[PDB]
Amino acid sequence: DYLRELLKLELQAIKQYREALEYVKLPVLAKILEDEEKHIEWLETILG
Amino acid sequence: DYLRELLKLELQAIKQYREALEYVKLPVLAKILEDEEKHIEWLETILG
Ligand SMILES: [Co+2]
Ligand SMILES: [Co+2]
Numbered sequence: 001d002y003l004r005e006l007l008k009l010e011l012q013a014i015k016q017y018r019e020a021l022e023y024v025k026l027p028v029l030a031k032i033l034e035d036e037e038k039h040i041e042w043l044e045t046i047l048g
Numbered sequence: 049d050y051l052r053e054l055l056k057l058e059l060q061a062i063k064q065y066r067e068a069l070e071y072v073k074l075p076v077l078a079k080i081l082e083d084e085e086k087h088i089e090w091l092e093t094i095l096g
């Protein structure tokens with residue numbers, strides 16, 4: 001569950017860095033974004 | 049605004065990752081703190 005909630009905060013993180021990338025195209029949001037996709041997989045493996 | 053939002057997210061995040069890293073010491077989670085630690089760095093720069 002805590003793992004699950006970080007699984008969703010990370011999820012949320014994705015959708016927002018997504019939109020914001022969409023509107024300001026700062027390369028840097030780009031890189032963090034990819035780090036949150038990672039956090040996801042790390043989470044998923046740990047998770048269900 | 050979206051910048052402050054992102055800021056808040058990661059501050060949210062950094063906070064739970066810590067408790068989680070607290071309750072059970074899985075190096076993955078700290079590996080994720082350092083990431084969220086870079087992002088906040090970066091968010092701060094964009095925020096100047
Ligand atoms: Co993350
Ligand atoms: Co982050």
